[PDB]
Design a protein around this ligand. Structure first.
Ligand SMILES: NC(=O)c1ccc[n+]([C@@H]2O[C@H](COP(=O)([O-])OP(=O)(O)OC[C@H]3O[C@@H](n4cnc5c(N)ncnc54)[C@H](OP(=O)(O)O)[C@@H]3O)[C@@H](O)[C@H]2O)c1
Length: 316
């Protein structure tokens, strides 16, 4: 059973969650079932993954069979940037909630800070593959999302892939009702996010680390890309504890009080990824791992660098 990170709202977010990004239909339902059986309570979802309906089915099964109560689950989803225009925030949220078969979400995140062309083409692009921008901004979206919290449909709001510049732009908006409770970003020993975590924490904002294993499966993997699971120095630390490299990579975030969401649909791995509360990385081991920073992003996907609120140019 995972420990928790307390949010600014006093809600308790389980520090390990199950990721569902790229989890196929016909596997994601069983993945969520196995996860809940293994003690996972936090499940990370998104509209853009187009699998929320099967996640919802799995959650419903486990609740009606008394494996878990809704109050003890922590379900997070995300608003895609083709839906930043006011009425579409509502409609997109409604489809997410309907697919998940839930009555509320625990956290609802802005998935990406730059708005795209409004509509149900999720990846509007030109001939070169560059994203087509839209005029509604993440602040427009936030305004619409705040109603969901007013109505009890969402317990807390947060952001994802935001730089500290964009969080500042959000935090400094006059007339804000609700503040972000987390910033979900890529984080692992090759991209340690030291300044962003320090910034976020200084503002009472948690960090959720995605791609903690370096996302070995990503199709865009260049053969020369670095490989965390095969890194001899990560492997050394795992051997010392008779744990796997994956378990070290996950425990690394836990000891920084950072929430972490490893994705898997393989039952053995799902179980493995939450067996991280029976060992401790020492101070030297933590320091060694931090020294691996290469400022390397696996997940730079959006050729949206030409659009206004691009997160990945700033230092942090
Ligand atoms: N912008 C955003 O906010 C954003 C965008 C994308 C994703 N996310 C979230 O972050 C989550 C995690 O990141 P990620 O999915 O990119 O990659 P990841 O969790 O770093 O890696 C997943 C890959 O590692 C494999 N794996 C999992 N556990 C393993 C283990 N113990 N040993 C060896 N291999 C293992 C998985 O295989 P199998 O699945 O085949 O078992 C999968 O191929 C996503 O699922 C998603 O929910 C957020």
């Amino acid at each position: 059973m995972a420990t928790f990170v307390e949010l600014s709202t006093k809600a308790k977010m389980p520090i390990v969650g199950l990721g569902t990004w790229k989890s196929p239909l016909g596997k994601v339902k069983e993945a969520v079932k196995v996860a809940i059986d293994a003690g996972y309570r936090h499940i990370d979802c998104a509209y853009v993954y187009q699998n929320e309906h099967e996640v919802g089915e799995a959650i419903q099964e486990k609740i009606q069979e008394k494996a878990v109560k809704r109050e003890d689950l922590f379900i997070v989803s995300k608003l895609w940037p083709t839906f930043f225009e006011r009425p579409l925030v509502r409609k997109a949220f409604e489809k997410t909630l309907k697919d998940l078969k839930l009555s509320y979400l625990d956290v609802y995140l802005i998935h990406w800070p730059q708005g795209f062309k409004s509509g149900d083409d999720l990846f509007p692009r030109d001939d070169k593959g560059n994203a087509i921008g839209g005029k509604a901004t993440f602040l427009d979206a936030w305004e619409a999302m705040e109603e969901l919290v007013d109505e009890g449909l969402v317990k807390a709001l947060g952001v994802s892939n935001f730089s500290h510049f964009q969080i500042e732009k959000l935090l400094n908006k006059p007339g804000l009702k609700y503040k972000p409770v987390t910033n979900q970003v890529e984080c692992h020993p090759y991209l340690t996010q030291e300044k962003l975590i320090q910034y976020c924490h200084s503002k009472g904002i948690t960090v959720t680390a995605y791609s903690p294993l370096g996302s070995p499966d990503r199709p865009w993997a260049k053969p020369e890309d670095p490989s965390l699971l095969e890194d001899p120095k990560i492997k050394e630390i795992a051997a010392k504890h008779k744990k796997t490299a994956a378990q070290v990579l996950i425990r690394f975030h836990i000891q920084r009080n950072v929430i972490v969401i490893p994705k898997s649909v393989t039952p053995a791995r799902i179980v493995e990824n939450i067996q991280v509360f029976d060992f401790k990385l020492s101070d030297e081991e933590m320091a060694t791992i931090l020294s691996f920073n290469r400022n390397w992003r696996a997940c730079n996907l959006l050729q949206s660098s030409h659009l206004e609120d691009y997160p990945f140019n700033a230092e942090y």
